[PDB]
Symmetry: D2
Subunit: 334 residues, 4 copies
């Protein structure tokens, strides 16, 4: 049940994709990587990680490859995906991690370069969009290009699904307090057209737009147009948290909300539970897409009116990557 994989964009997500596949001893063989740099620099960045520490396997490079745990992985440096020589090592499924091919029409260039399927590590417009253990049963053997949405969608979606299923969500808004990422800036300076993105990320609370709630109907069709939200980007290197304020279809207590969620996390490798008073560094390295936090649940009620606040943590790097890999393994088998 092998399938050969190529990684396009060996960055925070792309490097963690290899990390995780070796960690779970996946049957997937990673045979090629495409980025914009030398094998040398990619070896350095794979070996040493500011968030997750030394790579658990050996790493070397040659003039045109990485040698990871004694296995050779070709390195290419093609700016445009249609020029990547994917057939040279039979890379059949591309894990598209650059941020620059987030649509069907743009990821087509990997199929034109000779791959069979593309799994995109970000929202990619109206395409099949999977949160593993929420809607992965919609994957079938005709799918060629799919998205796993954002970290934030993988955090939000299981909480939202559980609340919808148990109580119905009539309307809600989300705020995620999110670690800073590579889309931001180190010192104040231009960052494309987003003004807030131009600002020094480790020195500010920065409001930030995200489509996690807005496009939740790709993942949970029943909640199409029922959710909005945004992010506040904050100075932590990884580890994030998602609050959702909802009007539910039934009146509830906090205990009742927590039981329902506990039930949804039972035998669920994607969605965990805590009643410990954890903080974001405690989620770093999580193997869940989302961890519901029963300690932060809140019911505000006056007469026939009730607001329900529910909160879940996520490691927007490694946690999300575990979800991406669950999805890759199923997408490779169909």
């Amino acid at each position: 049940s092998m399938s050969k994989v190529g990684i396009n964009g060996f960055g925070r997500i792309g490097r963690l994709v290899l990390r995780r596949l070796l960690e779970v001893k996946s049957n997937i063989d990673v045979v090629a990587i495409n980025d914009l740099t030398s094998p040398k620099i990619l070896a350095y960045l794979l070996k040493h990680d500011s968030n997750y520490g030394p790579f658990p396997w050996s790493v070397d490079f040659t003039e045109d490859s990485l040698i990871v745990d004694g296995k050779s992985i070709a390195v290419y440096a093609e700016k445009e995906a249609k020029n990547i020589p994917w057939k040279a090592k039979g890379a059949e499924i591309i894990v598209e991690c650059t941020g620059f091919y987030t649509s069907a029409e743009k990821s087509q260039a990997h199929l034109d370069a000779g791959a069979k399927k593309v799994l995109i590590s970000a929202p990619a417009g109206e395409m099949k969009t999977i949160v593993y253990n929420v809607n992965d049963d919609t994957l079938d053997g005709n799918d060629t290009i799919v998205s796993v949405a954002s970290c934030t969608t993988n955090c939000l979606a299981p909480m939202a699904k559980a609340l919808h299923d148990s109580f119905g969500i009539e309307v809600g808004t989300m705020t995620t307090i999110h670690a800073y990422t590579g889309t931001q800036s180190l010192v104040d300076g231009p960052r494309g057209k987003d003004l807030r993105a131009s600002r020094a990320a480790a020195e500010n609370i920065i409001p930030h737009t995200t489509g996690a709630a807005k496009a939740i109907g790709l993942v949970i069709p029943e909640l199409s147009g029922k959710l909005k939200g945004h992010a506040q980007r904050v100075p932590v290197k990884t580890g994030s948290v998602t609050e959702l304020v909802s009007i539910l279809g039934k009146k509830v207590t906090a205990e009742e909300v927590n039981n329902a969620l506990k039930q949804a996390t039972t035998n669920n490798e994607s969605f965990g539970y805590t009643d410990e008073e954890i903080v974001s560094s405690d989620i770093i390295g999580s193997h869940f897409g989302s961890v519901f936090d029963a300690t932060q649940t809140e019911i505000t009620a006056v007469g026939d009116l009730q607001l329900v606040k529910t909160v879940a943590w996520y490691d927007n790097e490694y946690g999300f990557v575990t979800q991406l890999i669950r999805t890759l393994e199923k997408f490779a088998k169909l």
Copy 2:
């Protein structure tokens, strides 16, 4: 009244003096009580990690600070009752230690010779003032009053404007808030509070606040209608409060923003921006709260509507401007 003692010469305490002198007030700080030496209080007054060098000359002797040429006595009584407020003639005590946060406790200050107490924190069930929301509840008989928390001074003007314009029926707040001294630098015990034990500059840390819970003291019609909490994050000062409300009227973002723009007009306490600011831009603000029209969001499904409004606050210096606005008035009664 024109003479002030400060108890607790901390982040708040020191900025009080700074603000008074900034506005050339005719209130004079004549005495300070804390736990340390005038050497160390001078060092900290002069050198501030958040606001840079003090704008006036500072010096010290063994029992005093010398600030812009004027002498301020320094005491170090553990217990407020021992403070000789009488010596230098201190009429009003700005209480900033965090340790006398009630009517009974701040009484010690009157016992030690001062007429009135303004507490820099929530302080139970007393007159609790957000200037430019409910400062006209203050009368000449009042002796001991609160200015609530930073978060209170952020939330109350926003809630006031929305409630007057539209009605708030119910809401929940989250403030994404700068770490403060009640937290820990490294992981280790901080009384009984598990989350306050964790390294503050390396974590997003959920935290209890009763700014929403106790909003009734400031806006009596909203009693029991709001709840909320904080997420404490690694910025040294500058914070932001989000309120999700159910309003008594359907609204657009543009309507919400114009009602707020209007409430902020010629309003010393409560400002407005439609610029794409971030937390560092609020550092040194002269408002208690700055409504950010860029973050307004209306989520509507039929007859159901969630309204998210967002306002920034310098939880240090912004809040202090309010404390000093209230102090200026309280000293005239």
Copy 3:
């Protein structure tokens, strides 16, 4: 039939990491008691959740008077004064003194009054027997009762200094360590005893800081006694630090010759590592060495006969130092 029962006094950053490392290495040493100033509940929470190293790798539960760690019960006491700790209840023999409040022989001998047999102090503690493992642990003997492992900084500096002095001679030197902030500092600007600089917000400043690592190096390397001075610059990283030594040596060297001597001193040495990779401080986090010499930073400045040599070593001032503490403890326990 060697000493096998430990008590930890001060279950803090160092104290909790002592237990962690003992379990990691499958030590035959059993931690039977902990003394701190708090409830089992809070110590359990802190042990389970660590901002720097992540989730405890073993099970953690607690009762009203104990912790249960990997299924093994550990008594918890809360005695502010060491002389009242009831060490004899579970038979604690060696105390790992990690509070910071008992940094002398006079102070720490209170644990002996309290029923323990020996004390190992996780910090410099005046002129008592002071051990950097794999530098001068051969000086430790059966009669040693109270001993120090000096600081994180001493455990970083000493093996570099030892190699250099052995190979070339150190005539004189000055150290600066760029060091993670620690609990002795302040979160926000406010009083912190009488040290002015320690009053300043640690995660928002570069803060000069006095350390005796160099001053007191003679305790560990007798021939360098009074030959070194130094200080620290505390900076906003949570853990991971680096020590620079600038020396006048007794011989003209090249950078290559200094690197090869250092390489050789780090061979078959579990305490002292070597690197020639372009690493940064987060890469030293969780290191099992007390010191890692970095050949990339070596620098020889020479004008005629005047020569200055700068050598640089990383250290994880929490975990890496803890590994050294544990190496010394294991030895201590069997003398």
Copy 4:
């Protein structure tokens, strides 16, 4: 020459304009070249994460900024040779991009119709000026010159003082330096430089710098006598330079301190402190360097002696004060 253009409207570029306005310079900034829209440049000028709100008005058009009411043309030419400096008559270009740090490269601004270039960084073997150390060497016929680095502006006045008083025979420097835009926010490729590829706000990152090696361009008698390097650390601005020297005379610390105190007297570029300051206290400094008497250390064994001296610098605003001093003189020759 009164008319200036800025290439690279970055941290240095923007603070150049801010400082010129602050000292009410007679220099007229007429044009700015960068890579982006006047809208984005306006936003960045208005709101500064390190120094707060811009003290003057800022607006924009599709091709200009309006700053304090004055129009500044905005161009977006990634090759300096195509920047149309002749349009508004920009004569002196303040070259702040990092991409033209050599005579051969900056020559392009002259080809593009300017008369002089002042580079905000080391630029090899050309006239390199640390103001109040070697500005006397600036010559009427110089058309391309350097102000070296931040670090060079810190080190040079301290080295000069020590060398003139005691003779510096050999020495080595380490600067513990705030992170800059040459580093990375998250771990990722940053050219060929491996350490620049690492998350700057989460690491101590050793970094090469020529400030010591190139010192001869500023203090010729010290050519080849110094070496050094930096450690980049998680502060947003404000840095400190340590120098360890063998001097030509035995000294005490008071002696070194006194000598340095004397060098700083009446010196707009080179300050002195004997207060226990930390890095945030240097932010917004108007000196190129502030010598710190509190950190001086003399280590002596027999006849050998090592002297450690230490100076703070605001690598952004402090350095820029030097750039401006140099610019004002350069404009008048």
